[PDB]
Structures are given as C-alpha cells and as structure tokens.
C-alpha cells in the first residue's frame, strides 16, 4: 500500500530529524567544550602568574624577617 510505504517513510524521516537534532547537539557540545578549553587555558595562565607572584612575595617576606 502507498499508505504503508509512505508512513514507513514518514517514521524514517522523523528518525532522521531526531538524529539531526542529536547531531547538532553533539557538535554544539564539542564547540562549547573547545571554548571552555581556551578559557580554561586563560585561567591556568592567570593561576601560574599568581603562583609566581605569590612565590616571590613569600620569598621576600621570609627574607625580610631575617
């Protein structure tokens, strides 16, 4: 029947649309993870510089009470 093949085809196309939604969702996920990654890199840079400054300050304070 044309009704059966067309409804079958309909379920198929619906499955394709759902899969497209999942696809866009996964790619979006990858994108966000990348962005978060670079921002995390920035955070790490700030943290390392902070480690340096703190370390210097600690050496200075420790040497000042000597």
């Amino acid at each position: 029947a044309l009704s059966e093949i067309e409804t079958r085809h309909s379920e198929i196309i619906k499955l394709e649309n759902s899969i497209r939604e999942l696809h866009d969702m996964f790619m979006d996920m990858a994108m966000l993870v990348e962005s978060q990654g670079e921002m995390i890199d920035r955070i790490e840079y700030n943290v390392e510089h902070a480690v340096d400054y703190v370390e210097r300050a600690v050496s200075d304070t420790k040497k000042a009470v000597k």
Partner: protein, 63 residues
C-alpha cells in the same frame, strides 16, 4: 533496496548506542569537573581573602 535500508538502520542503531555510552561517560565527567570547579573557586575565594588581608596589613606596615 530494502535490505540496504534495514542494514543501514541496524548500523545507525548500533552507532546510536555508542553515542549513548559516550553521552553517559561525558555527563559523569562533566559533573565531576563541575564539582572540581566549585572546589577550585572556593579555594580561589579563600586565597583572595588571604592575599587581600595580607596586602592590607603589608601596606599598613609601611613606615
């Protein structure tokens, strides 16, 4: 062909299952790292406080 169609359906189904496993592991990892970011940010606030107080005292000791 109907055979190629159904076979494609099967392959797609399996790959989808793989995507499920990936999604779950991903989710757990994201949660753990969220908790991690929370802890790190708390430590960040504590260290912010310590640096501000120590710097305030330091500048006050000038003279």
């Amino acid at each position: 062909r109907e055979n190629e169609m159904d076979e494609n359906l099967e392959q797609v189904s399996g790959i989808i299952g793989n995507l499920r496993h990936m999604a779950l592991d991903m989710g757990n990892e994201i949660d753990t790292q969220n908790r991690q970011i929370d802890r790190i940010m708390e430590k960040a606030d504590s260290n912010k406080t310590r640096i501000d107080e120590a710097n305030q005292r330091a500048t006050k000791m000038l003279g």
